[PDB]
Ligand binder design. Sequence first.
Ligand SMILES: [Mg+2]
Ligand SMILES: [Mg+2]
Lengths: 1114, 176, 315, 52, 94
Amino acid sequence: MEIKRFGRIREVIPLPPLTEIQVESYRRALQADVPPEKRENVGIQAAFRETFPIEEEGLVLDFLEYRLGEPPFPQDECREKDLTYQAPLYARLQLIHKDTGLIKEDEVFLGHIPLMTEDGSFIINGADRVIVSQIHRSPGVYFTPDPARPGRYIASIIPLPKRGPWIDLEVEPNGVVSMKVNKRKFPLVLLLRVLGYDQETLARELGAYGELVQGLMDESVFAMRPEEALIRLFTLLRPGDPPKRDKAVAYVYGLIADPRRYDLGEAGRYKAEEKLGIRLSGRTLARFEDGEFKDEVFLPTLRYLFALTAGVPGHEVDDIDHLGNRRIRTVGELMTDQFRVGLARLARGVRERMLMGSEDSLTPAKLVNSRPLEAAIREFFSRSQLSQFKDETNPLSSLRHKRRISALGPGGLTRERAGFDVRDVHRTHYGRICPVETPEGANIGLITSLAAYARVDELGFIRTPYRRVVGGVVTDEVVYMTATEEDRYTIAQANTPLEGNRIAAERVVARRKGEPVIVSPEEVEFMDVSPKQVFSVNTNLIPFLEHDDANRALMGSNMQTQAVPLIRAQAPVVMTGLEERVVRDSLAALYAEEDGEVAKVDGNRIVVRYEDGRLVEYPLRRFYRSNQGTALDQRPRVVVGQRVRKGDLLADGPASENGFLALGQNVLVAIMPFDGYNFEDAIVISEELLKRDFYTSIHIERYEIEARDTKLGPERITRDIPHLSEAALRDLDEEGVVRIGAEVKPGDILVGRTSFKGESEPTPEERLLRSIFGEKARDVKDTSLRVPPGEGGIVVRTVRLRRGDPGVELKPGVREVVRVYVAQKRKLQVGDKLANRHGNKGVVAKILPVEDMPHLPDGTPVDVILNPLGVPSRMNLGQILETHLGLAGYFLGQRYISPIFDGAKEPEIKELLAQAFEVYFGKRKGEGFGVDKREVEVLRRAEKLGLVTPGKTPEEQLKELFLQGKVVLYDGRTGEPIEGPIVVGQMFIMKLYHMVEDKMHARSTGPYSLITQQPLGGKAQFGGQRFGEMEVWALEAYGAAHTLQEMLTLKSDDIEGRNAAYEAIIKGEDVPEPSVPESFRVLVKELQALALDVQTLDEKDNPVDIFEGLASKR
Amino acid sequence: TSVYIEDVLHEFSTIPGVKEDVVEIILNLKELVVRFLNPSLQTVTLLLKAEGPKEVKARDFLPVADVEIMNPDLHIATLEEGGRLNMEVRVDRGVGYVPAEKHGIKDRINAIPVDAVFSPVRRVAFQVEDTRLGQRTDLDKLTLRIWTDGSVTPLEALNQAVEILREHLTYFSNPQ
Amino acid sequence: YYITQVRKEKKGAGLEFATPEEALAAHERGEVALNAPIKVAGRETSVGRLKYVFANPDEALLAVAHGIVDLQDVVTVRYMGKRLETSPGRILFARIVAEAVEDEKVAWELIQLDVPQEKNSLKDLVYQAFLRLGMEKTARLLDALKYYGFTFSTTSGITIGIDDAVIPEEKKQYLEEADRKLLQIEQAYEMGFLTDRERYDQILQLWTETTEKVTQAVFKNFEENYPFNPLYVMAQSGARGNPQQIRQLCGLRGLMQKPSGETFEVPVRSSFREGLTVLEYFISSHGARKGGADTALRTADSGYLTRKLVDVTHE
Amino acid sequence: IEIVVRQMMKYVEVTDPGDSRLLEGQVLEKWDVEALNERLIAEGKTPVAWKP
Amino acid sequence: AEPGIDKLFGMVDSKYRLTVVVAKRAQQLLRHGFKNTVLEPEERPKMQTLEGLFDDPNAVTWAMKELLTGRLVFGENLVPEDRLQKEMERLYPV
DNA sequence: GCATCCGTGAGTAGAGAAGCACAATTTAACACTTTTGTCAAG
DNA sequence: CTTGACAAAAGTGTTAAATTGTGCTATACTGGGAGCCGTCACGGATGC
Ligand SMILES: [Mg+2]
Ligand SMILES: [Mg+2]
């Protein structure tokens, strides 16, 4: 099956590593491989050099170097033992006695740094996790216009998040400039005097604008000394504190001049110098040297604000949503920030520990307590919003999750504060953030994906590549450049015709500061690398993207993540060219390290004899359960003795076919209504799909149970469960666990556990019951683990971890834990959700036998029937073009690669359809068959609909229909043809993770809440359905008073009513009259706890006791 | 309908020395075409014992009386040096498509039920032409095209189909 | 709708004969089509009305089963004691309503025979049946319409191909005409006759009119050349789609708005069938994101409003 | 809409208490003041003056 | 739709009165084991069971069909509630 | 009259970091009868 | 149907260890700490 490639744009550079946003950022933070003496002042190395040295003010604790040891356990062991894949951290510290002059050095153990895997994820407590990158306003100096009053501008100084206060400079109507700090507004003149500025200095610099300087020349404080002006400012900031020079200087220094508390950041410092045209020595608003304050940024900030207000040409306002003003915090920065917080907490503990207790005899090991450092690190990787449970339904799911950009999280935004501006597609998202990929709903515009060619720089600004154009010729020089730098050039489109390297078109479509313009070739300075850089990886996997509406392209890209791996997964007939790169960069498949020969091939492992001679054995991940329950296995794709080159595929990963991403099946699709089973996005499939095991997926469910220490005796995991027969214990082995390979159904025991019964005398009816039968009550009860309803399958793995095992850190009181893995082979059934890459989704509503499906005249039935009514409103025409191209490739036996926006056009598809007709119909002629009578009838209608040209032969008219993607289709039920030609072709359809098997739930009676006594929620807890306010409104509107009262009382929280209702039903009786809900009783008692006398009265205003006399004191 | 492999407990496992896992092997076995030469034969068990390194095919099953393998060249598994494959494949006779969850046939404890597609017919197409006789030209020429796996010839399948329809037409005889 | 819409032909439309036999003779030679509008003496008729006169609906539908006529061909059928010039499909629809309500005379008054059955007409039929017959008979009628509606849509031959989104020949003329007038605005702008905002408003009005004319051309092309086109039939019947969505598939995408709300000067000149360019797709992405953001915030505001209304009028 | 608008106009403001215990500017339902006025007129006392 | 639902709605001034009458009659039928029914033996509702054709156990179905016959009298303050319950028990023992 | 701070509200489902001494009180191990419960005897 | 007497079961009174509660440490030490932030409109009051 050959692959035909479409497209005319030549990409000079390939896609960058798709996980480099995760991998490279964490490498830069750790710096684990670079020797300590060559480590740069970034990452956790910067954290050590910032908090250290710790001075008592004559004991100094200095930092020299750190090192990271090898992880205690491998990644597979951490997953199996619920451990964190982490590396021990040791810091080599020295304690300096400034009085004596003696230095003692030792290496202290600071804890464990979690390690990133090769694919770019973390294993936290045995679970795979991904740290999502965060987007926020970049630090620096910004100048936005005052909305309340026109003609006025406000200066904003933003440091790194949680690394200083936000500062506002505004020109008050009185003419004096004001500085707002910590919600306290005060005149900047006072602070500006503190930093050593006289009357002539301000006039010499800011006096060339107009009346603005006159409001900055209040001589009431200019004659005042800076020292008392510093104290005077200290009173305004925090009023009431006793004015002391030592305390006042510390507060001001810690507010704007302390690098340990205020940090403008490398990105913030660079933005400040670029905007104000200055050069900062550090990353603080001011420096404190020689016992006095020197200005760093306030004067240039006020100079810019005055010039902006005056109206000089070189000054302009700042768009805060401009992507040059928004930066990305990657995993390395997020971990480093939390590492610094923990290090600061550790330093504070060291400082308070080094000022008391055996001062002469102190060591860095004794002073340093690493628990605050570990607690902050553990908190970040476990309970942070940006630390998310890894989505690994399929390899594309994990790849997307690592490239996600979130505006939420700690230090970011909340939906309430997220308006139409942070949620919108800014013009600078072009080539940096995918415009279409985003979660529809409350998260639209807040969680986004990095563009395919985009990369995050050191400062956190997303750069996109462009080809340099000089003299009208497009060169191979590629420049990665930010949005603010992009605004300075005229950038042409990647589709501009070129004769070699010279631009051929006289009129070139280009962008100038995001606006589309028509320019000459000599005015073009840069060119787009490819159409693919505008979109993310998921969107780049949608063929004929240019023919789909953006709202439906959003759905198609998102649902590719939800596709489950299939046992017979196939790469799509129509591809975009990124299928191989997604598999390669996801690290789910296995490739040869260099050239060599395969020595051993097995389902468990592959051994390759490389040219250098070393034997490398690659264990194969087999039937591994992902975070979503999908089975992730690698199947070998080589044979013994086969010669492989460097990078050649050795074993396909999940949802991959010969190194190509395979998220679904390639099936024959007929676009036509079918008896209402296609109604409103419903999908009709053939039974032939189940016969050959398409859309069949393997899912593994994990069940866990613990044997605990109890005050009544310890729980025992054993096969001897009281009061059960041999049939219930048939599949349990001698240890009480179900045997591996046994088929389990709901209600079957997975593992037997007996718990000692609580000491409680039995009811007299039970006592007589045991007395009659002469059976002594046992001391243990059945607390074994059973299959929940609607679940089951085949037991494939049993994991038993016991207390005292190496590396097994069980919680106290737990003797052992048993984990059982149950695998089920799920076939496609009614209610399962199918989707394609173009946003067309629906559930299977009907499965037909092969003889019922519409079939081709040659006898080939279709596989899937799709409703044509889902096309016109959704405006996603790419599925139609995929169907047309798929039809041609079905008969020509070939697949196609059509890149988005540069690929197969209709003239190219129709000429392929012409060749496909010669095998579709030319084969029929050779076999000795003419034109069907049924085909003649369809052609008679076809010329009446204007689909074929009158006067042509039936063969020519059939060819005309084929070039339109339409064929004569017969009804399998009647044998008669469909009255009009039907678009029949081959389309790639995915099976999504939303399955009716995991979503069906029902409950009659079950667990109830502790306080409200209402049924719990969720299928896992066997809970009831929530009957909310709107559902109550529906019954009120219907007038169903008694139906409403049952749900309020009899079925939710009437303890007496629900017990009596159940007993009445099982006796064949009608349910009794309901009583007061228990939630109302809770409300009354809670209202009484608020010192409110709430009493229910009768017709005569007399109190009525709704507590049955149980709360009345005698 | 059922397959048992020595030292294999379920279908979600791999066999040492065998490139394919049990799921893939079962998928290969679903393509096996077995022809019963005895009309009274209802169930047969095919025994396969192979040792690596070899590419075990459908022809490597032990011969059975009145049983013929119609596709001896079908690939079953790839054996690596040091790998062994001892299988007991049970072939039943039936109609329609019976999933493994319905019949659940296990000849022994570790036998794996297999979804069964008993239909030998692979594809059917019928063609109608404009034939003429005498002075009337609206007559029909019917041409039935039958593709079968080879265990049943297309002529036999057509004869059985005619009999099934003929028997169903006798159901309209006695009114109630 | 498919079985109730009548076919219109143009092979011999507007040609006049003298006797009905002469009109039938022309149809035999292929000069005039079966449903082509003709005049026998002074009355506008067609070949199908004269050639096929059926004594009852059963005979008319028997001919359809035997392939002589289609459900959409206009013929002569005697029904309810009246000589009706309608199609068998329209006669078939009358029998569907009559058998569903088990009353032939009342069902005759409940339907509009001489129009294709669309969303509004079917809604009117359901409401009229409810008033005259009650819920129980209306429910049976609804099930009968559902059964036949699903049955005929399956065998109708309704599909969606790329050629079904027919591009009118007037789009190229309008785009060239708009380009010529676009240069006029730019030429006048350089002459000082109009300001910057006047130029911006002039371009938007030019493209707004061009967008509307293309929409008319798309539906006019369907009306005269492809009356049974899938997109046209779905839009006219009220099943799926609106003229705005049909234009984006067959005409042009149109003007797009910037994130600030300002409209881009250059519209997206390509439809979904032709395929947008990379720049046009990104330009259209601002509106798609804005619409989705509007939808998310509107549901909370609408739900909040509903709860206020419930809590003020619940008594 | 009229059902909701009816609830939006349900309250009135007292402009002149008259011979009642109400206060000028007090807000109360329209029905109550009309019912209160009926008793006041039925005994000769000054009715409450109110505005919608 | 329920059989004769249009006729059921036409016999009451308020549609919710029909529901009250049907529900109260259904519990009267359930209380007395369908022995107080006004339906003739050929008029009793039936359901199809594998063993055979048996009486319909749904009293709501019985109550709706009884009201269609017209042998039931409904209204407010017809008879005292205590007198009604006692008299039905006597003439229809259960 | 107006300008400002505070308070209120913003859709529904589901799935998810001191020892130590000593006294005072309680627990648990004993012994003890004393008490039910029970199997011979009539 | 009473012995009756008899061992187990249960109650009970000491006594011990164990657990728990409380007091007390004598160079001099004398005003904290973390935040600090991207929504918007709406009453309602509180003063100016
Ligand atoms: Mg077979
Ligand atoms: Mg005639």
